[PDB]
Write a protein that binds this ligand. Structure first.
Ligand SMILES: *[C@@H]1O[C@H](CO)[C@@H](O[C@H]2O[C@H](CO)[C@@H](O)[C@H](O)[C@@H]2NC(C)=O)[C@H](O[C@@H]2O[C@@H](C)[C@@H](O)[C@@H](O)[C@@H]2O)[C@H]1NC(C)=O
Ligand SMILES: *[C@@H]1O[C@H](CO)[C@@H](O[C@H]2O[C@H](CO)[C@@H](O)[C@H](O)[C@@H]2NC(C)=O)[C@H](O[C@@H]2O[C@@H](C)[C@@H](O)[C@@H](O)[C@@H]2O)[C@H]1NC(C)=O
Ligand SMILES: *[C@@H]1O[C@H](CO)[C@@H](O[C@@H]2O[C@@H](CO)[C@@H](O)[C@H](O)[C@@H]2NC(C)=O)[C@H](O)[C@H]1NC(C)=O
Ligand SMILES: *[C@@H]1O[C@H](CO)[C@@H](O[C@@H]2O[C@@H](CO)[C@@H](O)[C@H](O)[C@@H]2NC(C)=O)[C@H](O)[C@H]1NC(C)=O
Ligand SMILES: O=C(O)C[C@@H](Cc1ccccc1)C(=O)O
Ligand SMILES: O=C(O)C[C@@H](Cc1ccccc1)C(=O)O
Ligand SMILES: *[C@@H]1O[C@H](CO)[C@@H](O)[C@H](O)[C@H]1NC(C)=O
Ligand SMILES: *[C@@H]1O[C@H](CO)[C@@H](O)[C@H](O)[C@H]1NC(C)=O
Lengths: 153, 256, 256, 153
């Protein structure tokens, strides 16, 4: 079922004249380059990038916005531990300590609720959560939208 | 003209009960920078649902390519890019999802100024996204005041909160920003590096020595602009890692 | 009489090209302690292959139950214990595997002295295993001098090296011990505890606080005899862990 | 394919009269208790257990025996990190640093060769390696038997 060659398909697809037409894209055909999932050049010529987003988090938490951070726990590129220490640096107080959330009868991952922010892990999911754990991913998004903690059994 | 952006049917697309729109918004007139977006709406029964801006990372990677096509988007592409299948867990079952290719030069987004692609950065990316938004709302005035969220992954751990702050500070009354959500995202370089290496070591993917070398080499660096000590260290990690997908440790790598 | 231990065919067993034997060896006459073994031989074309003693842990768990029936053994049991299927990757494709239920009171192994089951320990378990071996070789004298290995998992991280030392020191000339192999085994309590908690934390299975509490509570304890501080700490970990299989983090738990 | 209820089946099976007969077990029918995968009592009434196996390892390494230690890297009961620190305590010198071993074209896990001992991890396998990664498990055993390092591509 899982298919790791997805980027291959997309590249094919989006490079179709018919698709662009339907999407209303590259309309005048003036983008002389083939469509790619990413731009190397830009990727390799990046400029400014603050080291920490924390201060923004601080601000926005003060501003009272809803802030959720999640992590597919089998990703090795920007792994869970990274997030854990990073959120950890905000020093927020905890309202609901690390607990297992369920989708049905299975543990979908874990969650911790802090004052001002919710942290949620998605069990067995890699970097692209909605790709590896699509069902769990959807539950996660629904709760976030609702501003409700991830569910116990 | 939001109506003109309406999509009729994509090639090989199955029939669905929700609408989609896609097209361009100019974000920098002088430069000739215009971003392409793809909006996949929730079905009637879920309306009026929130509006969620979704952003992929890279930097330099496309929200349409990833988010929309192999992640939370309504469809998945067939092999050989033959057609589409419906994603049974599409997030547009519950929200109006707006995928943005950004910055200009990514995906279908484009710039009339060549050098734009050598000068991209966070600040500009954000200011342009902000521009994009204000304009998009004018084009889709029925979205004004809708509860609005911004979400994304990885490098978008920068994009999201950055754009979020701009929105918040801008005090634009038609944009009802309620919050943001970040998945596996950059948050703080130092902490991130530290957690990253620790995780690797705890997943048996590097040696003890390389673990230590990484910690010593990269700790004062940015994730996106590592020092040469940092890269040298990572080069070894990479060799130790072998042929696995670092983006998903227990799943296979693509053979084609 | 090794011949008498020969198995003809087990119920629901498919046909195979190798032999198997099973039966008892008395390890303590006074006590009336006798251990049951199961030998699954390699096929002819791989002979004369080594002899490998395989031990499961617990302590108190059966090598036949685990090793032989849901691990490296030649067969797997059908649902409802209806019959058997062949394990395509059985280790007996390459070695003569000897599974030992131990100590007495485990699996099919038994003791005539009731209290034996309340007084089990590593030393005795090892000395009895040693006894078992010397006797087994007398019963299977064609195995004398065969290259011999001892292998096992988890609590067997104690059993294996312990038995190995006894063998080595015993200087029994018919036992050609060449080495041992341990899988996910106890090696050193302190280091093990430390690594265990770290791994858990890096797998998102406990809170930061519980991670710390565990480290503080269990560090000076044995893995098998934790202090009450240690258990109290682990009780919380367990609650944090929820309904997962700790023995395999990304696989499902049995529903029946 | 993977079935987590295996113990259930075994228990059924081994409790059959016919099976015991074929195995030559509980011959006189005098074991008045039903067969179990483990013994609780013993499990709960264990005595002596040294804290460290290290000294034995030291001895046996000196004695020149072959010593291999392995670990299914998705087990949480006696996890990889535990083994890593434990072996680490022997302070042995390394002969071949941590490297990915292959089964075919896929990485089966990793291995490090020290002077006197080989450490091998089995990728994606839980506690019971031959159960979760049976193919890899077999490769592991074959090499061990041969005294040969786990293979590169
Ligand atoms: C980037 O450069 C293109 C050439 O100027 C241009 O394509 C059109 O640009 C102008 C106006 O901005 C149009 O009026 C011209 O017809 C021109 N040529 C083409 C290919 O049509 C891009 O303009 C964008 O594309 C056009 C199709 C049209 O919709 C413009 O009005 C539109 O903005 C110009 N893009 C910019 C500045 O974003
Ligand atoms: C544990 O106790 C059982 C009763 O003594 C015994 O079963 C037999 O024990 C003796 C001898 O050791 C036999 O000669 C008797 O017939 C006795 N009764 C039965 C049930 O047969 C166990 O002995 C073991 O079982 C027997 C079937 C036989 O093979 C014995 O010779 C055998 O060792 C005794 N087990 C011990 C001491 O290991
Ligand atoms: C924009 O449109 C161009 C014309 O349709 C298109 O050119 C094609 O280039 C590739 C597709 O990348 C190839 O499949 C064809 O040979 C086309 N021929 C031309 C005119 O060059 C270009 O790639 C498109 N830009 C994109 C996809 O970003
Ligand atoms: C040894 O043999 C006993 C008799 O065959 C057996 O007794 C059975 O007990 C259980 C099986 O545990 C049950 O299925 C039957 O009702 C049997 N009846 C008797 C005589 O008690 C006993 O369990 C066996 N011991 C084992 C399996 O270790
Ligand atoms: O910012 C990132 O890390 C990369 C970016 C695109 C991507 C996704 C998956 C695999 C490869 C690339 C993203 O994650 O959206
Ligand atoms: O020593 C151990 O940890 C337990 C022992 C039996 C067992 C295996 C798997 C699951 C449960 C129990 C073993 O691992 O052989
Ligand atoms: C950020 O970008 C905007 C738009 O390009 C610019 O006007 C503003 O001064 C910038 N701030 C910087 C570059 O520090
Ligand atoms: C270990 O066990 C053997 C056999 O039971 C005993 O003779 C020896 O003295 C024991 N050593 C101990 C208990 O320290």
């Amino acid at each position: 079922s899982y298919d790791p060659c997805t980027e291959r398909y997309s590249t094919a697809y989006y490079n179709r004249r018919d698709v662009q037409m339907a999407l209303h894209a590259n309309v005048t055909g003036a983008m002389n380059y083939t469509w790619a999932t990413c731009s190397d050049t830009i990727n390799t010529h990046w400029h400014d990038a603050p080291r920490s987003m924390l201060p923004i988090y601080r601000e926005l938490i003060a501003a009272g916005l809803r802030i959720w951070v999640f992590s597919g726990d089998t990703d090795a590129v920007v792994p869970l531990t990274a997030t854990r220490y990073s959120i950890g640096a905000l020093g927020l107080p905890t309202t609901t300590s690390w607990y297992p959330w369920y989708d049905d009868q299975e543990v979908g991952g874990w969650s911790q609720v802090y004052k001002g922010l919710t942290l949620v892990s998605v069990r067995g999911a890699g970097h692209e959560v909605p790709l590896h754990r699509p069902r769990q991913a959807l539950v996660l998004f629904q709760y976030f939208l609702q501003g409700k903690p991830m569910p116990g059994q | 003209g939001h109506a003109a952006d309406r999509i009729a049917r994509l090639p090989g697309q199955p029939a669905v009960d929700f609408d989609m729109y896609s097209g361009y918004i100019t974000v920098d007139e002088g430069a000739g920078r215009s971003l392409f977006y793809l909006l996949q709406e929730a079905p009637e029964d879920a309306q009026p649902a929130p509006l969620v801006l979704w952003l992929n990372g890279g930097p330099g990677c496309s929200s349409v390519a990833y988010g929309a096509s192999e992640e939370l988007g309504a469809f998945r592409v067939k092999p050989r890019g033959a057609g589409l299948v419906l994603n049974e867990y599409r997030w547009n079952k519950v929200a109006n999802v707006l995928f943005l290719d950004s910055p200009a030069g990514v995906g279908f987004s484009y710039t009339n100024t060549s050098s734009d692609i050598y000068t991209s950065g966070d600040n500009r990316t954000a200011h342009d996204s902000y521009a994009f938004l204000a304009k998009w709302f004018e084009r889709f005035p029925h979205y004004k005041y809708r509860d609005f969220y911004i979400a994304g992954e990885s490098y978008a751990g920068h994009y999201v909160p950055e754009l979020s702050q701009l929105v918040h500070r801008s005090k634009n009354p038609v944009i009802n920003l309620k919050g943001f959500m970040v998945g596996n995202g950059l948050i703080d370089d130092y902490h991130d590096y530290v957690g990253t290496f620790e995780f690797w070591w705890n997943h048996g993917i590097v040696s003890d020595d390389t673990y230590r070398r990484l910690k010593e080499a990269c700790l004062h660096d940015s994730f996106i602009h590592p020092s040469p000590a940092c890269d040298a260290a990572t080069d070894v990690a990479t060799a130790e890692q072998g042929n696995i997908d670092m983006y998903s440790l227990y799943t296979p790598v693509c053979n084609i």
